[PDB]
From a paper:
SOCS2 is the substrate recruiting subunit of a CRL5 E3 complex that negatively regulates the JAK-STAT signaling by targeting substrate receptors for degradation and blocking STAT5b activation by competing with receptor pY sites. SOCS proteins share a conserved domain architecture comprising of an N-terminal extended SH2 subdomain (ESS) that functions as a bridge at the interface between the SH2 domain and the SOCS box enabling ubiquitination of captured substrate, followed by a central Src-homology 2 (SH2) domain that recognizes a phosphotyrosine (pY) containing sequence, and a C-terminal SOCS box that interacts with the adapter ElonginB-ElonginC complex (EloBC). SOCS proteins serve as substrate recognition modules that impart substrate specificity to each CRL5SOCS E3 complex. Here, we determine the co-crystal structures of SBC in complex with phosphorylated epitope peptides from its physiological targets GHR and EpoR.
The BG loop of SOCS2 is observed in an open conformation in the SBC-GHR2 structure whilst it is disordered in SBC-EpoR. The 1:1 binding mode for EpoR could be justified by the presence of Pro(+5) in EpoR, that acts as a strand breaker and prevents backbone to backbone interaction with the second peptide. Indeed, from the alanine scan, we observe that when Pro(+5) is replaced by alanine, the affinity improves—implying the possibility of secondary peptide binding.
Numbering used by the authors:
A (entry chain A): 30 to 136, 148 to 198
B (entry chain D): -3 to 5
C (entry chain C): 17 to 46, 57 to 112
D (entry chain B): 1 to 103
Write the structure that this text describes.
């Protein structure tokens, strides 16, 4: 699989999340997260030419933004020039977000909790999220293979 | 810019 | 204005028409009364809860809350939601 | 702010909404347009306590912070047949099976 195909699969899952806000601006994200609980996040298109996506997250000090870099077919958080550039990188940007959400499941360092949905997602996708939080073994589930195929297209917990 | 963050030690 | 959704165990759920029209399957079979021979009441009740949750948070500017789904029902609810297309 | 309710009697269940400042009597008027029974033949309950038509839904304990769409509050309904009012009976829903080994 060449990089272009890998990036396309990563972008298709982004549209299946329900917290991808497209061409949202920096101030538009400030208002949707101004009163949200700490850790509430969303992902949107970066208005910068050197970046594809940007994480807008509500912190205790207020809403902020952190861009996502795409280099050598891997997504990673924006950090210093090579001082801390060997860090967590994944082929899927949803994987990158799910990785950091589960990391802060315990209780600067990024703190993500619950995403800010654009609209109410489908009941099918809501069940998939609840199932993904319980087990990762789709074969051991009493479901028709049509639904097992559905569970594989989105294996994340966020 | 002003409302953006980078990761730093 | 209202419709009647009957579960497999006989429970009658009276919903608003526009709320039940969230499901393309219910819309396809429309009337004023629809039976479901494979969806039990404890699942169909939750489905009706999703209808209200979906209509309320369709174009509203307020933050959408999480829809609670217990793991004991997620497998049955996933099969009913795929059958109803919602 | 609206209040989201489950009006339940026997095996019937009504999904409807009303404002927290609306009265119990106006809720019985909602039941009347659905089940064809005037409010004089209705007895609304929150759990076991009977609700007075004058009190608002807020005064009865149905606050907006609890009776949300994703989890509506249950209101028992009893009809009057002939001379007296029937006992409030709400048939329970079915029960989920045992989870698979993977969960």
């Amino acid at each position: 699989s060449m990089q272009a195909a890998r990036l396309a699969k990563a972008l298709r899952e982004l549209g299946q999340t329900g917290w991808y806000w497209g061409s949202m601006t920096v101030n538009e994200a400030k208002e949707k997260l101004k009163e949200a609980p700490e850790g509430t996040f969303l992902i949107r298109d970066s208005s910068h030419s050197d970046y594809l996506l940007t994480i807008s997250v509500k912190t205790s000090a207020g809403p902020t933004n952190l861009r996502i870099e795409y280099q050598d077919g891997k997504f990673r958080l924006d950090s210093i020039i090579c001082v801390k550039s060997a860090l967590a990188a994944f082929d899927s940007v949803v994987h990158l977000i799910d990785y950091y959400v589960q990391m802060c499941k315990d209780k600067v360092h990024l703190y993500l909790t619950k995403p800010l949905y654009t609209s109410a997602p489908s009941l099918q996708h809501l069940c998939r999220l609840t199932i993904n939080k319980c087990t990762g073994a789709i074969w051991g589930l009493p479901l028709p293979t049509r639904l097992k195929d559905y569970l594989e297209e989105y294996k994340f917990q966020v | 810019s002003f409302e953006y963050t980078i990761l730093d030690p | 204005m209202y419709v009647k959704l009957i579960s497999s165990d006989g429970h009658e759920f009276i919903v608003k028409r526009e709320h039940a029209l969230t499901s393309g399957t219910i819309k396809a079979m429309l009337t004023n009364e629809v039976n479901f021979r494979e969806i039990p009441s404890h699942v169909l009740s939750k489905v009706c809860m999703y209808f209200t949750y979906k209509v309320r948070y369709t174009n509203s500017s307020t933050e959408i809350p999480e829809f609670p789904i217990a793991p004991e029902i997620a497998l049955e609810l996933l099969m009913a939601a795929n059958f109803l297309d919602c | 702010m609206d209040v989201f309710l489950m009006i339940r009697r026997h095996k019937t269940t009504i999904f409807t909404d009303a404002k927290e400042s609306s009265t119990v009597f106006e809720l019985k008027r909602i039941v009347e347009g659905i089940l064809k029974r005037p409010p004089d033949e209705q007895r609304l309950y929150k759990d076991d306590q009977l609700l007075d038509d004058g009190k608002t839904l807020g005064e009865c304990g149905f606050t907006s912070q609890t009776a949300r769409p994703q989890a509506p509050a249950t209101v028992g309904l009893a009809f009057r047949a002939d001379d007296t009012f029937e006992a409030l009976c709400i048939e329970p829903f079915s029960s989920p099976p045992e989870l698979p080994d993977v969960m």
